[PDB]
Point group: D3
Chain length 143, copies 6
């Protein structure tokens, strides 16, 4: 059982905690192969959730949640734990907004399981910032 | 100057470093009267800026920059410096996503200078999450 | 999955990285619902492992590895990450020394999956040191 | 008065705090010639001690205590202070178990005052891990 | 608006908080262009001040205050935030005492706005310690 | 030895590393019974010392060294290690500036061995700032 799997497996698990059916996504922040922070698709803590009270639409989607990736980053900021020089495992490739946050934060590698459309600017930023992104299936597992 | 005047002064001050024609924003994160992190309208560090190579519009908005509020938080993350129970001073009241991010980060007060129409969800959130928001102008300052 | 199910899941998960034929153990140190450190049946990092060069028996026990519980704590030490008032999830209940180490480290709960005969001194200790110990199975998990 | 002495002297002092006559041993963890953690031969804190209630035998010795070396390491884990890249001063060379812990922790040098039998595996591990161990008498001192 | 200005401007602002008219001086400790600590001319916190109760003379001056520079350093020590490898912006060049403290602390650059007489020993120490000091006017600013 | 005896012992111990003929001082900063930082009569690290090149008198006092009390605090600053709510053990009671620095740093007790005439302002301060000061001799110690 490799770290990539151990990590990519944790993402899929955490993504199940998404508090808004519109999207199940999980993210894990690793440093020295050590999980430091995690996140899934959910809104502010101690706040209603698209699950209990239904979505919070605004011409389109339940804007109620904070993206998993972002949530992971916020966990570092709230818990005061450095994210610079880390890598990340995400169920889906980050949207353009998160991609900028992750990079700004100092994340040096994006490991996704799947991805609809990777924003071209994402790719540009990643290139300029010299950050690699790699697909990596979710390992099938035991009891 | 008062503490508020000193902080809001910095908000207005740091916003001047913005690298995007379209907006000059500045955020100051404070904990126990100490500026711990800041932010302004800027893109990912070490990447082109709407300033040097021009904007990256897409739908009518140079999507290059990262909101000051966020950058201030990202800075916290990136440096392991905690933003739990902090207070923010911003030139303009946060958009709905920054609001979420900020509350999720653990900030308990948002002291703004300018403000359009605070999003309804913003208040629903600040209300539930018991965060207070106050207006305060930029003290006129000497040298 | 429940929080317990997510943690005990990782315990069982990380134990798979063990490098010693004779035992597959996995420890997950948790603080405020965040996995902060982990461990599995492994020897010193960057040294031969019962896996590659075979066991180092002496009296009938490959003494190469370090107990998962410990490695999880050592990881805490090595990274300056605190283990005070944390909670541990382990595949098998701690031997008497790990029990001591864990309590001395400041963990207040030991959630195990499997358990032989908890040492009497173990209970004397957990009792005095007011640490609680709970059993919980590994949730059956998908992909 | 050299640091080696200042440190080796502190070990002998702390070793006097051993809470079990069966063995008086002290240990000091240094980083940048700065004491970061210490330990002596004693059991879990806020627990009985071979001193007050007599030993806790198990076909041999009072298993009641945690080895000084280990205790020092635990202090880092409990207090959340990094031990990686540190050196150590111990009244006696570590047993094979502690030797593995210290190495795992990232201790880069063992300074002992005395030593019965250094486990061969200890020497092997230390070699593989490129860690030096040196004997160093205890300086005689003043008032 | 350059960082030198942003920083030198903050010093002049903080210097206005001096709680003893005999001297208005402010200091800012920067690391990675990030303010980490600050200080002005004032006495121990939660103590009287040459402002409210008049000076505390001793054949010369109100010894009641702690120099701004020193206060900044103390803020790091009290708040537990590393000052090694930082630079500093001060309204006035440090006296010989502070100069030694700053250097000991690990401050690698002194940026002053003005300076009466720079103690020769200061210059010597700075040279031996390879630390540069630079004058830098205070930028004139807005509302 | 008692805890006090162990700490005051170190104070007297570390003062022996002083590099200035004229005074041998030693400060031990303690938090929850752990020596966290120390100091002795020494100049800036990596600079000539009254010991090697002779004193730097000016008005009759080798102004080279930095007071032990301070160096202990500077060490705290330089290493990000907090000195809030700590306790200090010193060979000689602090001069008025160190007293200020120490209180401002957040230490709540000053356990000295020797003491000339405590400055009046020192008491005014320790009184207001509710810091207690105690005398205690250096325990006679063996090897
Ligand atoms: Zn939803
Ligand atoms: Zn996103
Ligand atoms: Zn633009
Ligand atoms: Zn925004
Ligand atoms: Zn084996
Ligand atoms: Zn064990
Ligand atoms: Zn015993
Ligand atoms: Zn041992
Ligand atoms: Zn005054
Ligand atoms: Zn000064
Ligand atoms: Zn001298
Ligand atoms: Zn002094």
């Amino acid at each position: 059982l490799s770290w990539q799997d151990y990590f990519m497996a944790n993402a899929e698990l955490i993504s199940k905690r998404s508090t808004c059916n519109r999207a199940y996504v999980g993210a894990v922040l690793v440093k020295n192969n050590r999980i430091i922070a995690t996140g899934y698709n959910g809104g502010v803590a101690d706040t209603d959730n698209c699950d209990d009270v239904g979505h919070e639409m605004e011409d389109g989607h339940c804007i109620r949640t904070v993206h998993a990736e972002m949530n992971a980053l916020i966990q570092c900021a709230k818990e005061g734990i450095s994210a610079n020089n880390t890598e990340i495992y995400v169920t889906h490739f980050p949207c353009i907004n998160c991609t900028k946050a992750l990079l700004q934060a100092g994340v040096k590698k994006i490991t996704y399981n799947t991805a609809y459309r990777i924003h071209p600017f994402a790719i540009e930023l990643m290139t300029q910032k010299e950050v690699e992104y790699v697909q990596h299936d979710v390992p099938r597992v035991k009891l």
